[PDB]
Each structure stands twice: as C-alpha cells, then as structure tokens.
Amino acid sequence: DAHTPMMQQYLRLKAQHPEILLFYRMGDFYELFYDDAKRASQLLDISLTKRGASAGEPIPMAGIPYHAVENYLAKLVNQGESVAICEQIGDPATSKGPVERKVVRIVTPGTISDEALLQERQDNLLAAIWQDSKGFGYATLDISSGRFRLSEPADRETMAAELQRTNPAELLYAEDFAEMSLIEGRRGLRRRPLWEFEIDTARQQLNLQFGTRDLVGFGVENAPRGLCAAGCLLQYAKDTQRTTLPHIRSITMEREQDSIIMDAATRRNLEITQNLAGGAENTLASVLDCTVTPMGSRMLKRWLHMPVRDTRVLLERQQTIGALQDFTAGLQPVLRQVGDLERILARLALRTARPRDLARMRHAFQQLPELRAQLETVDSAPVQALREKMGEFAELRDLLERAIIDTPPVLVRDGGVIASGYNEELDEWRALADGATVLTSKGKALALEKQLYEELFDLLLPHLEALQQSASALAELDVLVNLAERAYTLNYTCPTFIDKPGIRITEGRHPVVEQVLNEPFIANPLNLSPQRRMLIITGPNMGGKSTYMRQTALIALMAYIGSYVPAQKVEIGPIDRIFTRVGAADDRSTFMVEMTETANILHNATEYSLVLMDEIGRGTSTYDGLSLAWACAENLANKIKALTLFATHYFELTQLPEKMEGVANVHLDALEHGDTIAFMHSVQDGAASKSYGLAVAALAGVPKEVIKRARQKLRELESIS
Amino acid sequence: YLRLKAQHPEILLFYRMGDFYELFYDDAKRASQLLDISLTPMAGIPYHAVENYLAKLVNQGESVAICEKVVRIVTPGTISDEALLQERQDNLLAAIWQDSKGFGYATLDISSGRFRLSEPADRETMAAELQRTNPAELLYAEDFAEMSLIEGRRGLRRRPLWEFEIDTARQQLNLQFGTRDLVGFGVENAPRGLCAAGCLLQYAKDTQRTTLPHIRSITMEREQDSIIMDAATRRNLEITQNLAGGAENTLASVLDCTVTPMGSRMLKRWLHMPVRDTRVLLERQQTIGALQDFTAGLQPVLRQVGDLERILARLALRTARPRDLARMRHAFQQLPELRAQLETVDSAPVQALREKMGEFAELRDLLERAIIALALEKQLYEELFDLLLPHLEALQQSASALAELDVLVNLAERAYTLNYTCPTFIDKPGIRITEGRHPVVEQVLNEPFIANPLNLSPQRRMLIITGPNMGGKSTYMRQTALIALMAYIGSYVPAQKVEIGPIDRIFTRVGAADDLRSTFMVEMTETANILHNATEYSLVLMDEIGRGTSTYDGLSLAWACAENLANKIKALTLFATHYFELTQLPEKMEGVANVHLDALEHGDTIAFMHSVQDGAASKSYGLAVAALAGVPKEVIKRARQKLRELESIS
Ligand SMILES: Nc1ncnc2c1ncn2[C@@H]1O[C@H](COP(=O)(O)OP(=O)(O)O)[C@@H](O)[C@H]1O
Numbered sequence A: 001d002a003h004t005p006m007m008q009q010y011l012r013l014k015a016q017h018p019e020i021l022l023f024y025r026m027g028d029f030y031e032l033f034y035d036d037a038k039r040a041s042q043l044l045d046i047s048l049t050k051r052g053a054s055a056g057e058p059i060p061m062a063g064i065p066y067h068a069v070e071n072y073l074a075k076l077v078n079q080g081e082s083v084a085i086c087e088q089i090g091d092p093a094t095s096k097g098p099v100e101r102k103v104v105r106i107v108t109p110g111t112i113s114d115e116a117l118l119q120e121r122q123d124n125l126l127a128a129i130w131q132d133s134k135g136f137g138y139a140t141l142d143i144s145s146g147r148f149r150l151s152e153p154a155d156r157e158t159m160a161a162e163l164q165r166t167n168p169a170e171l172l173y174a175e176d177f178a179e180m181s182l183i184e185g186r187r188g189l190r191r192r193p194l195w196e197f198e199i200d201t202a203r204q205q206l207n208l209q210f211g212t213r214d215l216v217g218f219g220v221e222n223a224p225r226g227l228c229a230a231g232c233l234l235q236y237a238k239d240t241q242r243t244t245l246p247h248i249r250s251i252t253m254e255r256e257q258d259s260i261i262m263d264a265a266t267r268r269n270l271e272i273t274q275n276l277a278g279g280a281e282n283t284l285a286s287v288l289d290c291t292v293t294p295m296g297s298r299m300l301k302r303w304l305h306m307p308v309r310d311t312r313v314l315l316e317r318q319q320t321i322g323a324l325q326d327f328t329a330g331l332q333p334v335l336r337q338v339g340d341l342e343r344i345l346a347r348l349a350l351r352t353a354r355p356r357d358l359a360r361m362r363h364a365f366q367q368l369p370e371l372r373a374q375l376e377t378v379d380s381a382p383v384q385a386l387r388e389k390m391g392e393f394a395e396l397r398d399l400l401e402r403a404i405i406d407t408p409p410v411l412v413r414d415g416g417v418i419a420s421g422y423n424e425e426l427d428e429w430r431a432l433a434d435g436a437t438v439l440t441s442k443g444k445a446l447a448l449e450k451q452l453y454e455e456l457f458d459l460l461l462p463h464l465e466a467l468q469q470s471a472s473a474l475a476e477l478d479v480l481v482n483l484a485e486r487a488y489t490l491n492y493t494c495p496t497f498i499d500k501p502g503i504r505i506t507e508g509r510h511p512v513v514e515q516v517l518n519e520p521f522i523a524n525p526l527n528l529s530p531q532r533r534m535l536i537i538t539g540p541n542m543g544g545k546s547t548y549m550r551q552t553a554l555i556a557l558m559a560y561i562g563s564y565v566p567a568q569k570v571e572i573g574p575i576d577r578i579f580t581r582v583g584a585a586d587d588r589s590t591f592m593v594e595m596t597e598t599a600n601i602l603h604n605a606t607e608y609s610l611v612l613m614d615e616i617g618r619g620t621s622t623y624d625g626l627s628l629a630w631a632c633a634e635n636l637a638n639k640i641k642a643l644t645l646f647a648t649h650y651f652e653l654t655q656l657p658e659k660m661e662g663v664a665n666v667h668l669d670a671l672e673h674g675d676t677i678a679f680m681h682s683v684q685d686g687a688a689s690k691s692y693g694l695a696v697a698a699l700a701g702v703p704k705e706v707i708k709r710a711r712q713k714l715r716e717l718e719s720i721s
Numbered sequence B: 001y002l003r004l005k006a007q008h009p010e011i012l013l014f015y016r017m018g019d020f021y022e023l024f025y026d027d028a029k030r031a032s033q034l035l036d037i038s039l040t041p042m043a044g045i046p047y048h049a050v051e052n053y054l055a056k057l058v059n060q061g062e063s064v065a066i067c068e069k070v071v072r073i074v075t076p077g078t079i080s081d082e083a084l085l086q087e088r089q090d091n092l093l094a095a096i097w098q099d100s101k102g103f104g105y106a107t108l109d110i111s112s113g114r115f116r117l118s119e120p121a122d123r124e125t126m127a128a129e130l131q132r133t134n135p136a137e138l139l140y141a142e143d144f145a146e147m148s149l150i151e152g153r154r155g156l157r158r159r160p161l162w163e164f165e166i167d168t169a170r171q172q173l174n175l176q177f178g179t180r181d182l183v184g185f186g187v188e189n190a191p192r193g194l195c196a197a198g199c200l201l202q203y204a205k206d207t208q209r210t211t212l213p214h215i216r217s218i219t220m221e222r223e224q225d226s227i228i229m230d231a232a233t234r235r236n237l238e239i240t241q242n243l244a245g246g247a248e249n250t251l252a253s254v255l256d257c258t259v260t261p262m263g264s265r266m267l268k269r270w271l272h273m274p275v276r277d278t279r280v281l282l283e284r285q286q287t288i289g290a291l292q293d294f295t296a297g298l299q300p301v302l303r304q305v306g307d308l309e310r311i312l313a314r315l316a317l318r319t320a321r322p323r324d325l326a327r328m329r330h331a332f333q334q335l336p337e338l339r340a341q342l343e344t345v346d347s348a349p350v351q352a353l354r355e356k357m358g359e360f361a362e363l364r365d366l367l368e369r370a371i372i373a374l375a376l377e378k379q380l381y382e383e384l385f386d387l388l389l390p391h392l393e394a395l396q397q398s399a400s401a402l403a404e405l406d407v408l409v410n411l412a413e414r415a416y417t418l419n420y421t422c423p424t425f426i427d428k429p430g431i432r433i434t435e436g437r438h439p440v441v442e443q444v445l446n447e448p449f450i451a452n453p454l455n456l457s458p459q460r461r462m463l464i465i466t467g468p469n470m471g472g473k474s475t476y477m478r479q480t481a482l483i484a485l486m487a488y489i490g491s492y493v494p495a496q497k498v499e500i501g502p503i504d505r506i507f508t509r510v511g512a513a514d515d516l517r518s519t520f521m522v523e524m525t526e527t528a529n530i531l532h533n534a535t536e537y538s539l540v541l542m543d544e545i546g547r548g549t550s551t552y553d554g555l556s557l558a559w560a561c562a563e564n565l566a567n568k569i570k571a572l573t574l575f576a577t578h579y580f581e582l583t584q585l586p587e588k589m590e591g592v593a594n595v596h597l598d599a600l601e602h603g604d605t606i607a608f609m610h611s612v613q614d615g616a617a618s619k620s621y622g623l624a625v626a627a628l629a630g631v632p633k634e635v636i637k638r639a640r641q642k643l644r645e646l647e648s649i650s
C-alpha cells in the first residue's frame, strides 16, 4: 500500500527471483533499485542515483540503455553474475494500471545464446552436479547447439578431470553436496533446492521433453543419478528461457569405455588448446587448426578433448580425408562462406535469431549445391553419406530470398528486412509510407513485418531437425577438409590401427616444435610394444628430453582424433588413458603436488594406459627421490604394465633393464668436437656413460687438478657400484 | 652537417633545425626504429621534449651528440640530468684497455665526482668489475682482444688507439688534479689503469666540452682494502636487484628506509663495496649506537635535506637547476638543528661528522637572497655556481657526511625496530652467529621466522646443508652471507650477537639454473672462477651444487669442489646440497659439519619448523609426504625398502 503501484509490481517480480539481479524496462533504460542499484554501481561502474522519493521512502536507483545492455551482460557473465531480463508485455496506453511486465528470460552464464556474449571458437556449457553415497550424477547441456550429455563419474578424482574438461561457465549443485572443495572456486556457482533432484520428476520431465515414452531409446534409463541432474538442468534451462526447447531433441551417455580418459593434469601439460602460461600460442590446436569456420574449430577442439576409441569411426574419417585431399583447394573457399550455422539454428530454435543470421543461413544454402557438385565427383561411401546428410533446402532458400532482402539490417525493430512483394499487404503498407516521399500505416507495416518475421520461424520450424543434421555434417566436413590440407602441407601420413596396445613411429617429428622452430627439427623414430613398453630417457639439460616424450603422446592423441600424423608412418594400439606427470615448480609443497598426481597414476593406470612421467625422483633428498621413482617405475612395469616414457636425471634408474623386463634406456646426446658442444636433438640407445659435464668442465676450465679430482671420483663411484 | 657527423660518425647526432632536431640517412633509420617516430632519409623530435627521447635512447644505451658546433655529447655514462637517472641507482662511466701484462679499468661517477681506477689481473676479474659497476656506457680500444666481455654491454663505444697512450695520460691526469705527481694519490705505480683514466677524463671532457673541477681526486681500489664479490654472487644475494630483475624482496628493500635517495645509493655502494679496515667499522658502529636514542628526532630533519650529492655534481658541471638549489638551501637550514642534536650526542666520530658538515650559513644567506624570467633565473644559478666553487670541496665533504649520517641513522632505526645488535670484529677469519634471523623473509612473511645460530671457525669452516625443499635449505646460508656482508658495511645485524673474522671475497653459486653457453657450462664457469680466485679469507656459498644432469657426473664435480675448497683454498663454505652422499664428508674430510633444517611430521600435518640442528634426516619429509595423498601402501612400503637399501649400501 505504501509503495506506488509500479514498485508494488516490481517488489513481487523481484520476490520471484530475489537471489539474482533484475533488469526492469522503463522508457529506454533498465532501472535497478535499492541493493541491486548498489551492486550494479560497483560492477557496471554506472552512477548510483536515488529515484525521486514521491512515496517518501529512499529508492537507490541505477539505469543502463537498452541498446547497450549486451555490453553490461558481458561484464556480468565474466564476473559469473546471473541477471533476469523483464519486459513490458502489454501496451502501456491500454493498461490503466502498471503495464503487465513479465520476466522474458534469465541470463545465466550457462544459458547465454547471444553471439555477442560467446567467444566464436569456444563452446559455452551449462551443467549441474548431484552427490549420492554410491557416486555422482553429472549432466551437461550445450544450449548454443542443443547438444545434451550425461555421465556418472565413479569418484572425486574423476569429478575434477570432468570439471576441467567441461570447464562449465556455470555449475548448479545441491545444498547437501559433501565435497565442496571441487565446487568452490568455479565461476557462476549456484546452490539449489533438494526437491529439484527427485528421480521420479526427472523420469517424467525428460520423457515429456523428448516426446519418447521410454528413455530406453537413448540408453539412459539404467543411470538414474545422472538423470536427476538432467531433470534439474532441463527445468533450469526451461525456467531460464521461459520457452520450449525443441532443438534439445536427444540425450547421450558419454561412456568412459568409448573415449580416451585424459586426467585434468595431463591436459594442461599437453597444451592441447591452452598453454601452461594460459596463452593460445604454441598449442597443439594452433598447429593443427587452419579451419575456415568457427564451428569446425569447436568440433575439432571437442574431438581433441574427447578422442574416440571405436576403430570404425576412425577408418571412416581417414578414408574421407584421403579422398578430400585432391579437392581441398576447391573445398576450403566455399566452406568459408557457410557461416556459424550451428549457433544460428539454436537462435532460430529459441526464436532469438536476427536477420543477419538469416542472411548467413540463406548464404549457406547457396553454397550447398556447389558443395554437392564437388562432393559428387569424390568417390567415397562416407563422403556421399555426408553429401546426403547436408540436404538441399532449395525451396527454403527460395522462401528466404523471397522473404528477406540480400543484405538485411541487424535489427527487425526498424524493418526493411523482408524482400518486397513477399506479402502483397506488406507492399500495400510500404506504398503509403513511400507516398509521402501515415504513422499508423508505418506501424501497420512494422507490426506486419514482425508478424511475418515470426511466421519465417514457423515455416522453418518443421525442418529444424534436418537443418541440425545439416550443420552437424558441414562442421564435420570442415574438420576433415582442414586435416587433409594440413596433411598435404605438413607431409602427414595416415596411421594404421592395430589390435594390440603399442605405438610404432618412423621419422617422428613433434608438431608444435617443428612449426615454431626456425632451425630444422631432427626427427626420431620411437617404438612401444608389449615388450618395448618402458623407455628410460636420460641426457643433457636443454637437450629436449621432455619434447621427445611429448611428440609420442600428441601423435597418440592425433591417431585417436582420426587425423594423419607428422611422421612417415605411425602404427597405434588401443589406449584407454593418457597420464602425464611434470614436476617443475611449487604450485601443497611441490613434492606433495607431485605425489598427489603420481598416486592417481599408480591406481588409475591399466595395460591400455600411456604414461609420461617427467623429472620424477625430484625428491629433495637424492636417497628419498631415488626410493620413490625407482619403485614407481617398477610398479608401472610389474603390475600396471602400461606404456611409459620416463624422463629421469637419475643415472641409477638406467640399471632397470638388467633388473626388470620391458625397460629400455634411450638418451638424447649432445656431441662434442674439439671445444664446441652441439645439440643434436636426436635419440640413441642406452646412455652417455661419460656425461657432457666432464667435457663442459674443460670449457671455461676449472683448475686442472679439480677436473682431474672429479675424474678420480667418477671412476671411484662407478667402480664401487 | 656532414663535417659535424664526420667528427663523431660512430654515434647519433641531434642537429638543431627548429624544435625538430633533424636526423638524416642511417641516423633517421635508427631513430625511426627506437623512438618509433615515422621515417620520412629524415626524422625529427621537438627540442622541449628532447629529454623524454634521450631517456628512451639512454635505456637502449644509444649515445647522442647535441649540436646548436656540438654543445655537449649526451652519453649513457655522463647523464647528469635527474630525469635520466633512477633516484636510488648509481650511474657510472668507464673505459677498458688490454696490455699483455693485464687490463687497465677506470671508472668515473660523473654524478658524484668520485673517480676510481683498478688493474684487475685477468679476464674473470674484469667481468666481476664490469657487473659491479654495471656501466651504462663502456669505452674500449680497437685492439681489444677479449670482445666476449665487451659485446652485449649497453652503450658500447670503440675508440682511437692514440687516446690510450701512457705519456698523454700522465700529463692529462696531473693537469686536471693540479698536482705535479700522481704519487699524491698512489696511482703512479699503475700505468695501465692511468691510460684508461686519461681517455675517460678526455671523454668526459669531450662529452661536457668544459673543465671538471668536482673530479678533484683519483683513488686506487686495492683488492686488499675491500671485499671482492664476483659478478655472479651479486645476482644471487639479490643485494639490489633480484634474479627476476625486480627491486622487490631485496636486501636493499628491507635495509632501505633511508630518508634521502643519496643515503640509499651510499648504502648500495657500501653493500657493493664492503670495507675491510676495522677502524672505519668501529667508528660507524659507535656512531650508530649513539644515534639509536635520538633516531626518532633525527629521521624527520634528515628527510628535508634532499639529494645533495647529485645536486653538487650538477652544480659543479654548471648544469644544476633552481629546484636543486631550493633543496641545497633547505639542507643548509636543516644543518644547525642537526648540529644541535649531534652536539648533545657523546661520541668522537659524531662530533667529527658534525664538523665535516660545517655551517655554510653565509651560503644559505646568499641562496635565501638569490632564490625564492627563465633567462634571469638561469643567469642567477650560473652566478651561484661561481660563488660556491671555492667551497665546492667542503660542500662535497658535507654531502659525504650527510649521506653517511642518513645511512647510520637508517641502520639505527632498523636496529631499534628489528632488534639488531652490534657485531664485534675478531682477528681470526671465523663467523659466529647467535639467534640468526634472515632479514628479507622475516619482513615479508606472516608466520614467525624461527631464528637459528651458526658457527664458522678455522675448524668449523665448512657446513653441509641438507633437508626438505621448501625447508629454507637456501635461506639459511643466504642469512649468514647477508649478515657477514652487513657486518662489513659496519651496520648492526638481525641476531642476538655476531662475531666476524676478516673476509677478502664472498663467492656464491645459487642453483636452479635453467637458462641457456649451456646452463651447466654457465654453472661450471662460475665454479671454475671461484676455485681459481678463492683464498683462506674467502666466504663461499655453493647452493644446489652438483646439479649435473647425470647424478653420477654431478656427484664427482661437487664432491671434488668441496674437497678443493677444504684442502687447499681453506675458505669458509655453506654448501646447500640436495645430495645425501655429501653428508659423509665430515668422516672423510676435516672442517666439514652437517647441519639440517627438518620440517616436523606429527599426526597428519607437516610443520615448516625452519629450525637448524646438527646431523641430517635419513627419513626425509618425502616418505611422510608420500603417506599424505597416499600412494598405494605397497608402493610407499617399497620406497622404505629401497631407502633402507640405499643408506645401508653407503
Ligand atoms: N628435435 C629437436 N630439434 C631441434 N631443436 C629442438 C628439438 N627438441 C627440442 N628442441 C629445442 O631445444 C629446446 C629444449 O628445451 P626443453 O625441451 O625444455 O629441454 P629439456 O626438456 O631438456 O629441459 C626447445 O625449446 C627447442 O627450442
């Protein structure tokens, strides 16, 4: 009663969502009040003012222009701040009371579909997490693509590997979640009510959204813990969008058995997309990525993060890439003009697509027939299958050309989007507007343009499933064409898959180093087999002991993304997990951090695992480090029976081949001719018994007695041993 | 212009052509690359903003001549302008000349008038001198054989051979000083150094186009009269600059709350040149103890003094500005109150320092009368330079006392705040410390620093440091060296009591070197340097020594390095060694004693005690750390089996 009718309406609207900020449309500004005005002034840096106190109560107020809202939304999403958007639904002149305002959408870091808020080559994801005594249910939704996934990771360590791989911009969780260490520090962190994670409500909700009576159609019925998170995520997405989500037409279970399980730590060391420094330079992706479209880059980045294990999918991709290699020069320019179809289709599905997006959609439709013509000559069963999957949609292109001008404006607010004569009534209203060169006829024309603009979505709504299938094939083709182009330019050769685990490489060249090094990369062959599983690496510092191992792992990863390899020939055996340990500096004390990942390597690793221990035995006491690494390799080669490329400074771990089977010493050797040392960066058998250090002692010579005394001591140490 | 450029063709020239000093041909190309000004060949920059571009070029070590006839040559060595000078870092100018007998190295601090000379015996000493001076500019002769030391230095200048003739130098140095014989400064018996001095004096004269009366003396820096720190040791102790190149977490950052930048520079010079004579140190300590009671009163008055030493040199060069004169008159106003506070103090050096500062009351009256139209003010300071010239020698003595007093007061304030106690000097070369506290970490760490005693003697010369990483294995040795260095600067020490023995050289080989000369080559180069130039009076701090890529290879080198350091060199050492095979040295070699910092393990928590004790931890914090975030119990058990095997075989 004390509040004026406009504030009474706002107070109830804020009461619906009191834990999140709200943008309330008034005139041309979204006004924030009281505590919200205070927070906005702190982050958006907008002036905090006070709304005039006609009621008498002070109302702290802040306002931002509607046309520049996206910039403020970007600032909030970086801070992980959820914001609700509310708009005037009724016409204010007709409404005697405050105009009926409703929350149109809730902008949350997870459900941002606006292109302005999305990095082009990075996928945005929304996920929720739930904990049962038995295990954890983790769900993920790519709202920007409609891609929906689910998983049930067995333990806390798996939860961390999944959380880094997904890197969710927003994470939902429950008040009862016990392990708050993993949850804390995540951006856009949300706590939720217990009732949202009920299994029965989820079973009905998922079936209703899909339209399928049984989730058995997607093989998710046997995993209830994950479904509970999915239902909350689906409800949260439905609540955040306030609309149906037809594009989210399927659920998939990401099976640990069907993919290479890379620990979060291995991912940072490989520098797959982001370096240890946090840069996007010297990455495996930049060397492997010269793709024309962002959709292809994201699919490539997803492929890198999720290497597939099934042989059939790999054999299908390689044959296609080899066939496409001849036409790659013709294919790359046409695919560039396709545009961001996957995000454009999701915006169309949400009815939030803009005319510029529609121009790219029709433009992609124009590129499809030429692609079909070039693909028809290519003789491969998958290439023809991809050609069929794209579809024609020529009638829809004709409809779009008829219903949109060739170069449309960004906003439908000012019109001039529909091509003339699509609607005889539209041209009739436009004729009155051009007659002067009438405000009611201008409004009639604009409202008709908006009504037809809604109809354009309705015309394309039935084919949305086919259009989504088309975008899946086009991005899929872009990756295959790029891998062929890179293979032709960087002389990559296809690697055969063999039944037994084991990697054999000939003339192996590390991809990132060879591209970024002016001096030639000296290539080295490597062999891993049931017998050649363990290689101890020794040699001079700055001798690239670390790079030799990185080359093998990146080659092994590339083999499982289905691409060619920077070697004359590669032979690869099935691999379940890739483990990497590199101890370089304190992050827990350095040794504690080194031990934590190593403990994980000692339990998780299995016969199909590839391990890359580096600088192990960095134990502060030489006796202490020697005891742990010597046992760690022995356990890695006695029970785990994994493949390892141990990089060890220790010269006492070079006696392993005599004591243990499967170990083989290999050393990168720097040559010394006269008084000059050279870095060969090449791999040779065994190790340099007389280290470069004695010769280095002669360079910038220490007193001759001192160098002689060392020779006496080195002879004494080896002889006593 | 072509004739003017021909006179100095090896350096850039600013040619006055309106505000824009127009540069042409190759000079225009270089200016476009560095000043980032568009190349049109010709380039130009405004006369009023010349100082900003000069600063950009000086950082790059590019000498520039200024012509209006060349009026002056602005070179990185002779930058007297305050805008081009870091307030708390010394700027120097030096030349180097090579004879078959040895090398002659000269240095001139143009910003103080302090002129020094030396004849280092070999190439390794030249590098130590070059880094200590860090000369922003270095002059050398076309015949110089060892170009490895010269190349990579900023402001590198090649010079004609005739400039390095001994006869011209003997006459030139005598003429500038006005003394018939250089025997008055004891430099006559060192001709190789004098040749460099003459070129440097001529170069300074050529660069300024004027006489240099402030340069009234030359001194021979005798290796016997100072502690000789090698270039590498200086980078590791982070005395003024950290390994990262920052000015943070430095011994200077903790020891420097000086009220005037001159005091910081004098402190930095004292740190860079520790004195060996006991009398100068006993004089300083008695003064600091007497000042400790009045430190609170002394600090505010000394802050108002200003940068007198650089102001006097600018006054001497006739390049001082009125803002500097306001600080000079202000310092003159502060002197009587200082004399009043110092008069009550009962100490022989404090009264001697009081006499050295003097009154200069007539000069203060003249300055108050002559300072509160740029041409009129410029005329005024030029007149003032002439008036203050006869007393310039006394004023230079006054700035030496004022900066010296600021250092003693700052050290007393630090002593009062951080409970520093004076260290007595002993004839025998041994360092005994009680409740020793490392200065930097106790001043940047929230949790309490745990202090530890250390003993070094003719018998306790070598200490092997072992124990956990992140256990301050490195910090303990750094604490002793910084204390030993601080004892020879004459300051109090962060401990209950310190006893110090005479030290000729401080050598350090800090570890963790992963920068490419390969890393191991750089590592042995500094070790080779120590084992050739170390003596009985040397204090050595090998750290992470024996980081040979092959553990067997590194073990032979470090084990031998220690044996040579304790059989012939007989120096004092604080070896920090990861190797647990160097813990057997006390049985094998006399003079070695094991000391270890051990993080304790009680229940499921590790505590960083940072406490020093005799012996070493056979069971490392790592076996306990293996239990935390536990590896499979069999794996940790297998390490115990191996740890028992490794120690038992030894
Ligand atoms: N095969 C190679 N051919 C040529 N240069 C190489 C090769 N491998 C490495 N390098 C170079 O040598 C350097 C070695 O650095 P790094 O791999 O960190 O050495 P280490 O692992 O021995 O410490 C690399 O930065 C790279 O420039």
Ligand SMILES: Nc1ncnc2c1ncn2[C@@H]1O[C@H](COP(=O)(O)OP(=O)(O)O)[C@@H](O)[C@H]1O
Binding pocket: B441, B445, B447, B448, B449, B450, B451, B468, B469, B470, B471, B472, B473, B474, B475, B608, B609, B610
């Ligand atoms: N007495 C002390 N008590 C607690 N922490 C300390 C103490 N002395 C130093 N530290 C802290 O512990 C750290 C140990 O790391 P670091 O000095 O790199 O180890 P190390 O000297 O073995 O290389 C120091 O950097 C400092 O932050």
